[PDB]
Design a protein around this nucleic acid. Structure first.
Ligand SMILES: [Zn+2]
Lengths: 139, 59, 213, 74, 99, 127
RNA sequence: GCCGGAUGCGCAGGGAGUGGUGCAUGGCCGUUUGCAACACGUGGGGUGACCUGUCUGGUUGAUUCCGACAACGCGUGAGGCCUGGGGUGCAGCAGGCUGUGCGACGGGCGGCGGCAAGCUGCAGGAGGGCAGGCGAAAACAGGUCAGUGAUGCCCUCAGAUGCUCUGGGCUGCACGCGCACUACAAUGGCGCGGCGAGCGGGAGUGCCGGGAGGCGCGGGCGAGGCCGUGGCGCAGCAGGGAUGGGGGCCUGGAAGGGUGCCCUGAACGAGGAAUUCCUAGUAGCCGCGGGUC
């Protein structure tokens, strides 16, 4: 997927996140407005639509892992969404992301048919390939 | 209806199962400074005397 | 593929070799013990033990040598299958430092003065073709104060890669009426192209020039 | 002390072949003669005190040898 | 399908082993693969020199490194046995996989 | 058809480059085109090489640069060395050689590390 | 609690002791050293201890060398050396791997010094004091008897200074001190998106949960940060995270341990006299992994 990269990365993200919100294919949890998103974070995310903006970021990470011909799970994906925890007087150690909402945000990407599992790894499917193709045609 | 812990009058069934003191140097009977690395289980002070005899090079 | 697994099994062959060489020295303490070498990666493990006397150590016509081989089959599960030990005597008894180390230990047991002991060995080292020998005797030789008397002669290197080839050093400890005496014997080896006497590769600073004629 | 059952069980064992015992007393069931270890060391400690067998120690393990001179006595 | 795997800590010994084995393998087969050398699996132990706390932070680093070599072919099991008899005068650890 | 591979590297950042006789000049470093690089210092350190050599030498040459390892700034000098090394290696293989000597003398006088590796590695002290 | 109080006819004696003595010792290690020193053979000077050799000077990181020389020849140490690091020749094989070599010697050039040793600048070059390793003789009443089935001697051995179990302590706290950690914020902090290392190469996965965590399969990993951007906006303030409260977990037989959530939100606004470390991929900043577990 060479044409994935030939548009701007963050400009892809709200175009992707606004797609997942408009098509209603990712569903909000009950406590979405108060999730720390890691145990290293100090506040909840300030953005009201942070949940979609992450769903665009996760689906982009599965897109590039398919471009690298590599399989990615939820636990390895949380490491990409971890920050460095202010541990008080101790040195600030890197901690992992919150796995719980990442698992549900990928299950909604299975319901839309974007992400189809291959063995024990979920992979991007042809439906995810096509629907990105109209998006990056428009960016 | 609680589980009663199998073992002594106190809780533990078998001591020398955990921590420093379950393990020892395999040469000099000590609990001080065992190299468990690479499954050696001989102490710091013995490992100098036997190092190149194992095949370790200083280098 | 694990790098932790491969290193662990090789030193497992190593850690028994350290125990076995430690065992043989306590086993053949009445004899001279000159070290051992092991070939363990075959299905028969071949143990070569170096003792100055060959006919005594094998013992009642292969009896005690199999008797000590029997308990070594029991102790080490690593290649419990096949072990064979066979003794050899050192070619030059002077050039092995442990052979000279246990020699003066026997002299100090017999209350022989160490000065008479130490010139007896360093003469016998020099007449056996070795290049240099230092003898370090540490302990309460005269009186309660302990001195480290250090006899030396000849070329003995201390630094270089040639150190691990050319000097072979020994340590034997003596327990007496008075206390503990440790006797270090470090001996330089003569260069010989056949390795029965010394290292095959020369010391790196030495060079040879051919002749123009 | 200890019953004569496992006393002579290792004593009859020594007449054919030599046994070695670790000093691991909380370890039970010696690999050859499955008897508690602090039993079997104490009688061989009696055997060296009666000067029958010879004991060689190396790395937590005692290598006990009965030399042939005392064999025909027993 | 034979996988001749051999591992050794000394390199001047394990290169004499692969040289005489390749002198033995070219007598047998010309489709024999060349000697491939896998990653030298190396390990280090860092240790304080003093048996007490009187000195400076004097740390002695000891190292072990085992060198791996491999051979791959598809031969007869009688040839595998005469290969096996050939590599027992060598102190290199030998293990074979027939898959 | 025509394709060369040259590598440049900083501290532990290694960078391959592939120069081909494509339709129009393009530099897609790490599968990302030069105009859309998020790091502008990555882009400008490529662009001043094009400014030094001049755009007429990059007429049809497509550079698909990949980089891995190292940090952010050592990735800049990894590809900057690899971009110039693959440029001169294309002229040495597929074009006339006296221009390649003309280009190499231009870059070496410009900056030494454009065409040769910086030997300066992370050399850590002991305790 | 238990007797590893064996054994020789209650005694003898062995054995044990993290009991004492490192000022009785071995070994090892530290320090002199981050040094450049040490010594012999023979000869000479002196009655002799000693001196020369081992030096006026120059030089070198080096008693390294040039040189003059009653010294001449040697030897350790220094160097040479060994390992890693960069450059590429060949060979073999498949975050590429590992064999074999080459490549730098201060060689070339210029100027000083000229039996010169060498110093210094430049060119060429991947590289012109790279980082380690071994490391002389002599010492020290350096440290270790608490690494030791290394140990002399002294003391203890049944109401034990033995072993083991349980609980407590080694974590007590008006106080003095060493080394570090996190800071005092805007060159910052917080929230998202984007890009992201090396040593080490075993681990991810699916599901539940807000997090910690859990469960079930199971050949298998990547950081602070930086960039973009939103908020705060000089405030003891969204700086700082000390202390404390309530809840959830993990490990373990057992929490004073660790982790997670909420809340409380201390001193600290640049630190006295003093004082440490450091010359390039270095200091510093910044995390990560391993030993311990
Ligand atoms: Zn030990």
């Amino acid at each position: 997927m060479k044409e994935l990269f030939m548009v701007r990365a963050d400009a892809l993200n709200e175009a992707l996140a606004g797609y997942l919100k408009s098509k209603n294919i990712v569903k909000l949890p009950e406590n979405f407005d108060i999730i720390k998103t890691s145990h290293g974070k100090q506040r909840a995310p300030s953005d009201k639509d942070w949940y979609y903006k992450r769903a665009a970021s996760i689906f982009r990470k599965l897109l590039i892992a398919m471009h690298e011909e590599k399989r990615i799970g939820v636990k390895r994906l949380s490491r990409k969404y971890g920050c460095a925890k202010n541990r008080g007087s101790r040195p600030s150690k890197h901690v992992d992301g919150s796995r719980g909402h990442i698992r549900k945000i990928m299950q909604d990407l299975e319901r839309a048919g974007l992400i189809v599992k291959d063995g024990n790894y979920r992979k991007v499917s042809d439906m995810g390939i096509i629907e990105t193709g109209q998006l990056i045609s428009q960016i | 209806n609680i589980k009663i812990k199998p073992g002594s009058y106190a809780g533990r069934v078998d001591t020398r199962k955990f921590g420093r003191g379950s393990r020892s140097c395999r040469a000099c009977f000590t609990h001080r400074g065992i190299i468990r690395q690479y499954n050696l289980y001989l102490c710091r002070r013995c490992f100098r005397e036997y190092a190149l005899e194992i095949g370790f090079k200083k280098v | 593929v694990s790098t932790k697994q491969v290193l662990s099994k090789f030193i497992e062959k190593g850690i028994m070799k350290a125990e076995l060489n430690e065992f043989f020295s306590k086993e053949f303490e009445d004899e001279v013990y000159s070290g051992m070498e092991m070939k363990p990666h075959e299905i028969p493990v071949q143990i070569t033990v170096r003792v100055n006397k060959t006919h005594e150590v094998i013992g009642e016509r292969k009896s005690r040598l199999n008797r000590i081989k029997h308990v070594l089959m029991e102790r080490f599960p690593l290649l419990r299958t096949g072990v064979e030990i066979n003794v050899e005597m050192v070619k030059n008894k002077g050039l092995c430092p442990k052979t000279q180390a246990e020699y003066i230990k026997a002299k100090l047991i017999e209350n022989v003065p160490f000065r008479r002991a130490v010139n007896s060995v360093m003469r016998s080292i020099k007449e056996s073709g070795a290049q240099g020998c230092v003898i370090i005797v540490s302990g309460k030789l005269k009186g309660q104060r302990a001195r480290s008397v250090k006899y030396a002669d000849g070329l003995l290197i201390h630094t270089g890669s040639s150190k691990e080839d050319y000097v072979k050093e020994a340590l034997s400890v003596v327990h007496l009426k008075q206390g503990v005496i440790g006797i270090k014997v470090r001996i330089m080896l003569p260069y010989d192209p056949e390795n029965v006497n010394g290292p095959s590769k020369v010391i790196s600073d030495k060079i040879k020039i051919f002749e123009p004629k | 002390l200890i019953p004569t059952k496992n006393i002579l069980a290792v004593k009859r064992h020594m007449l054919e072949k030599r046994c070695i015992v670790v000093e691991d007393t909380p370890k039970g069931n010696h690999p050859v003669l499955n008897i508690p270890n602090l039993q079997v060391l104490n009688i061989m400690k009696s055997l060296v005190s009666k000067r029958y067998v010879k004991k060689t120690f190396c790395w937590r393990h005692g290598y006990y040898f009965l030399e042939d001179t005392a064999v025909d006595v027993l | 399908s034979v996988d001749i795997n051999l591992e050794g800590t000394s390199v001047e010994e394990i290169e004499k082993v692969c040289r005489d084995f390749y002198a033995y393998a070219k007598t047998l087969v010309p489709d024999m693969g060349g000697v491939k050398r896998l990653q030298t699996k190396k390990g280090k132990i860092t240790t304080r020199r003093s048996p007490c706390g009187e000195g400076t932070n004097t740390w002695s680093r000891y190292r072990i490194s085992v060198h791996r070599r491999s051979f791959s072919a598809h031969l007869y099991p009688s040839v595998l046995e005469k290969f096996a008899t050939f590599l027992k005068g060598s102190n290199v650890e030998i293990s074979l996989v027939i898959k | 058809e025509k394709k060369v591979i040259a590598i440049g590297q900083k501290k532990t950042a290694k960078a391959r480059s592939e120069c081909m006789e494509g339709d129009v000049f393009s530099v897609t470093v790490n599968n990302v085109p030069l105009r859309l690089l998020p790091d502008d210092m990555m882009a400008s350190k490529l662009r001043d090489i094009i400014t030094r050599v001049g755009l007429k030498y990059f007429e049809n040459l497509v550079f698909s640069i990949t980089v891995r390892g190292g940090g952010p700034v050592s990735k800049i000098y990894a590809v900057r060395q690899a971009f110039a090394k693959s440029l001169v290696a294309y002229y040495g293989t597929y074009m006339d050689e006296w221009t390649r000597q003309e280009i190499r003398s231009n870059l070496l006088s410009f900056d030494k590390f454009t065409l040769v590796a910086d030997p300066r590695r992370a050399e850590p002290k002991k305790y």
